[PDB]
């Protein structure tokens, strides 16, 4: 049983593991470069091995030591989005097991695909510049030299330097500061992670920090001005942890932490161990989008423990999280709520799908990411697919609580480990072997290798979705003479969720006539809400209907923060309105430069500019 990281130019695991990290550097932020030595022990796998090769991209390398001594490597041409690879002579052969650390001096390019570096304006307290990283999937390699694959997983020790009146955080446990001895200016943040990790769940952020504790292992992270909202809006933590620990088994990471930070972040959140990444777009003020929450708790289990082996099996991480997430909230709330964000997702699913094309390649679950930037080819397929595909094997096999005995077993039985589909496959007909035939009715081909919707769509309560189709049913078919009829009441018994819905199915329909859109602002007033996900498919509904007064209130949103689940839809949108075409690619082409580096790279082929 052989597979390779097509993503990765560096030795694979059957040649040699790295299994520690050593990493001693310093944040340079008059130069925007990260400056250290990345110490790597590994251990070869091979007999007689006298070399391996190591992924980087934009990295400068100034010497390679082993045993005291500098040795030999070479950079190899650079294979776009991959990088280069570093081939690295090592000074004596080693044997099969045999372990050796090569300490690598390195520094990393202000222009970073893993990293964005803010000025004091982009932060919130303006007098001071923040620094963060992003190292899913493949942008590790853009911080320091390693396999940059998810199928080795190593544990790592570090020590960064930072200006004194900084605070430096990592995906690890704190371990300490101290004063620089070499630059009395400066700060020494330690850190450990003592559970092997494959190295995309490395994390970084240097900032004005302040702390809140919220639980018995849990504190907030923030700026100054962000503290006191984001301790109320991720109030639901401990609760979560607790229901999630019953689904999966222990909680091995010591402490969870929530870090929330500036605007451009790119994703909701990111399931950085010891310390979960959050979009600060989630402050609602209602704890309403507490789902992200859960889904990265969930993370703690599923992809950090259990980790799928090459990006072409993302789906295993995503789907069985979006899986877990579903269940606490179902438990937190009930189960007529789990199976409505159970039917909503099938909606963002029918999204995906139509908006790549149902044969398109990106629209399978296991894809084959041989020569694709994982970032290009990143969408809601293996989530909802990969959830679809659970929720309707749930369904298959006996309800909820026999799925959710596999489910802990499954963590269980591959936990610090890299998996592949296969892998899962085998051990659900093993944990389902007496259920075998009924697993011989599903169509694995279709489910796993084919594009567009699933071939089958699991069952799904309706009680909560009803209202929500209704009021965008009479929306739909209104015709003038009928729009008198809204009003404020409509939304009376809906929560945001409710409401959320209302807008998506809504959405699906787009456009609708201008005059239906000015009503609706006029009786629902939605743009005064600041819900992100509500204002977010508000602003679209109008874009994509045309009303020209939605433009600067979605290009303010599109650049005011970053997450691009929002901002690369919004721009597209405002790209598609002939109105609004040119300030699109205007304001993308002035922020650009201050924009994250994935984010920016990613609006830029939306649009077909550059
Ligand atoms: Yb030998
Ligand atoms: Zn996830």
Redesign the pocket.
């Known amino acids: 049983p052989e597979i390779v990281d097509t993503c990765s130019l560096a030795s694979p695991a059957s040649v040699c593991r790295t299994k520690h990290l050593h990493l001693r550097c310093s944040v340079d932020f008059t130069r925007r470069t990260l400056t250290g030595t990345a110490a790597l022990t590994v251990q070869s796998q091979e007999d007689n091995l006298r070399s391996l090769v190591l992924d980087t991209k934009d990295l400068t390398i100034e010497k390679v030591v082993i045993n005291g001594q500098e040795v030999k490597y070479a950079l190899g041409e650079r294979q776009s989005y991959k990088g280069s690879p570093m081939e690295i002579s090592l000074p004596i052969a080693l044997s099969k097991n045999q372990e050796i650390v090569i300490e690598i001096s390195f520094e990393t390019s202000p222009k970073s695909s893993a990293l964005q570096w803010l000025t004091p304006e982009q932060t919130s307290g303006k007098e001071h510049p923040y620094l963060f990283s992003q190292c899913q999937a493949i942008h590790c390699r853009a911080i320091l030299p390693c396999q940059d694959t998810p199928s080795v997983k190593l544990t790592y020790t570090a020590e960064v330097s930072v200006p004194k009146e900084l605070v430096a955080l990592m995906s690890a446990i704190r371990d300490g500061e101290t004063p620089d001895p070499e630059d009395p200016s400066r700060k020494i943040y330690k850190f450990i992670q003592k559970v092997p990790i494959p190295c995309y769940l490395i994390a970084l952020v240097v900032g004005a920090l302040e702390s809140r504790q919220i639980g018995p292992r849990t504190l907030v992270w923030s700026e100054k001005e962000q503290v006191e909202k984001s301790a109320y809006e991720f109030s639901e933590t401990e609760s979560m942890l607790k229901i999630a620990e019953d689904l999966g088994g222990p909680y091995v990471w010591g402490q969870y932490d929530l870090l929330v930070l500036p605007p451009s972040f790119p994703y909701g ?1 990111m ?1 950085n161990p010891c310390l979960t990444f959050v979009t600060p777009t989630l402050l609602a003020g209602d704890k309403s989008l507490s789902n992200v929450i859960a ?2 708790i969930s ?1 703690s289990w599923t ?1 950090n423990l259990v980790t799928n082996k090459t990006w072409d099996h993302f789906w295993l ?2 789907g069985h ?2 899986y877990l997430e579903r269940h606490i909230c179902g438990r937190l709330f009930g189960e007529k709520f789990r199976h409505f964000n159970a039917l909503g997702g099938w909606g963002e699913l029918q999204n995906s799908v139509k908006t790549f094309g149902e044969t398109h390649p990106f629209t399978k679950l296991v894809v084959d990411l041989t020569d694709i930037d994982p970032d290009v080819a990143y969408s809601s397929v293996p ?1 909802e697919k990969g959830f679809a595909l659970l929720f309707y094997l749930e369904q298959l096999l006996g309800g909820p609580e026999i799925f959710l005995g596999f489910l802990k077993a499954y963590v269980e039985k591959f936990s610090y480990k890299s998996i592949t589909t296969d892998d899962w496959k085998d051990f659900l007909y093993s944990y389902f072997k007496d259920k075998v035939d009924v697993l011989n009715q599903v169509d694995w081909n279709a489910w796993l290798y084919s594009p567009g919707l699933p071939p089958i769509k699991p069952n799904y309560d309706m009680t909560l979705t009803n209202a929500c189709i209704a009021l965008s049913q009479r929306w739909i078919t209104a015709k003038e003479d009928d729009l008198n009829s809204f009003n404020a009441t409509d939304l009376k018994d809906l929560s945001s969720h409710q409401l959320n819905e209302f807008l998506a199915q809504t959405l699906q329909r787009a456009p609708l006539p201008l005059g239906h859109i000015k009503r609706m602002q006029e009786v629902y007033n939605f743009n005064a809400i600041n819900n992100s996900e509500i204002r977010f498919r508000w602003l679209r509904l109008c874009i994509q209907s045309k009303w020209e007064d939605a433009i600067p209130l979605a290009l303010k949103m599109a650049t005011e923060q970053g997450a691009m689940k929002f901002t690369r839809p919004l721009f597209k949108d405002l790209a598609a309105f002939d109105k609004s075409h040119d300030q699109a690619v205007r304001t993308y082409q002035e922020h650009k430069a201050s924009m994250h580096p994935v984010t920016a790279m990613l609006v830029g082929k939306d649009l077909k500019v550059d």
């Open positions: 959140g399931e889904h990265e993370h992809g991480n995503e999280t979006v989530y």
